[model samples]
Target: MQYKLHLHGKTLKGETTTEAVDAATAEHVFKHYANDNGVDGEWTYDDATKTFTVTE
Candidate 1:
């Protein structure tokens, strides 16, 4: 499935889509990418909505 990730913060705001088998994997994908790319923020996921909100 495809999940939508929304990033909003003082210094950054953007949107991206990622493919994952499930919501859990989607969250992992976001966390991994955020860590690798140095994204510092508070993140939350809605499984029913399949959306990730990241506030930096």
Candidate 2:
């Protein structure tokens, strides 16, 4: 399905980009962001809305 990743804070502030992606891809981005950036407040996916929110 098509999903949008809403990134808030850090280097990701106010970014809203949509892409054709599966749940795993969203989860991977979420995990990878925390690992690579070293911070919490990092992510959640909404299956119904196809929205992935990655926060500060």
Candidate 3:
């Protein structure tokens, strides 16, 4: 089974980000984002809920 993560946020100018990514496709993305954004967090997924949550 595969799951997708969509991370979205708006900039001060209201520009928004919308990226759809799979688990297999997102590890690199996660690492890149973590490194670039200085983010330290855990990403959790719930099968029952079909939801992925990024905990910071």
Candidate 4:
């Protein structure tokens, strides 16, 4: 009994990503830009589609 979550693709960088996430937890991951080593970005998750949408 396991759940899965998948990511679409990057519309900005044109880079694509696909992951087999453990759908049991929401804290397992976040926006790549949000947790960049040095760089930063304000982004939030859209539970409706289970994605990290950007914020201003």
Candidate 5:
């Protein structure tokens, strides 16, 4: 499945899409992306939409 990561902040706003076999994998991918980018904020995950929304 394809999961999307949405980033929203005062100076950062963008979208990243990643392919994963399951929710766990998707979450891992999203978390890794966030870590690499030094994202500091709240995270919201929607199972139905398969999206991770982060607000910094």
Candidate 6:
């Protein structure tokens, strides 16, 4: 029904940000970052563990 994505690192200004997103929202967000942002990272969904991992 819902998912939580974890941001495991700090940004350039040193801030930890995390957000919980639904299925469609998370999918879109991940794709946007993966395609448009062009960052060296990933958004992973662990179904078994029921968690979302964001590595950047």
Across 1-56, the per-residue lDDT of candidate 2 in tens digits comes to: 55666666675454344444577776676556555764457577887877777777
| Model 5 regions lying over 4 Å from their true place | none
Which candidate leads in TM-score? 5
Of the candidates numbered 4 and 5, which has the greater TM-score value? 5
lDDT of 6 by residue, 1-56 (tens): 55554554345112122344556576566545444533445667776645566667
Candidate 3 local lDDT, 1-56, one digit each (tens):
34444343332111112244554454555545644654445666565644454544
- Clashes (backbone N, CA, C under 3 Å), per candidate, total 0, 0, 0, 0, 0, 0
Residue 19 displacement (Å), model 5: 0.6
Each model's RMSD to truth, in Å? 1.6, 3.2, 5.9, 6.1, 1.3, 5.1
Segments of candidate 2 deviating more than 4 angstroms: 18-21, 29-40
lDDT of every predicted structure (CA atoms): 0.82, 0.63, 0.45, 0.37, 0.85, 0.51
CA lDDT, candidate 2, residue 54: 71
Cα TM-score per model: 0.78, 0.54, 0.38, 0.33, 0.81, 0.43
Worst 10 residues of 4 by lDDT: 9-18
Count clashing pairs, candidate 4: 0
| lDDT score for residue 27 of model 2 | 66
Instruction: Tell me the TM-score of model 1.
Output: 0.78
Residue lDDT tens for model 5, 1-56: 89999988666689999988987788878877887787768889998888998898
RMSD of 3: 5.9
Q: Poorest 10 consecutive residues of model 2 by lDDT?
A: 12-21
Of 1 and 4, the candidate ahead on lDDT is 1
What does candidate 1's lDDT look like per residue over 1-56, in tens digits?
A: 99988877676678888998888888888877766766778988887878899887
Q: 19, model 6: CA deviation in Å?
A: 11
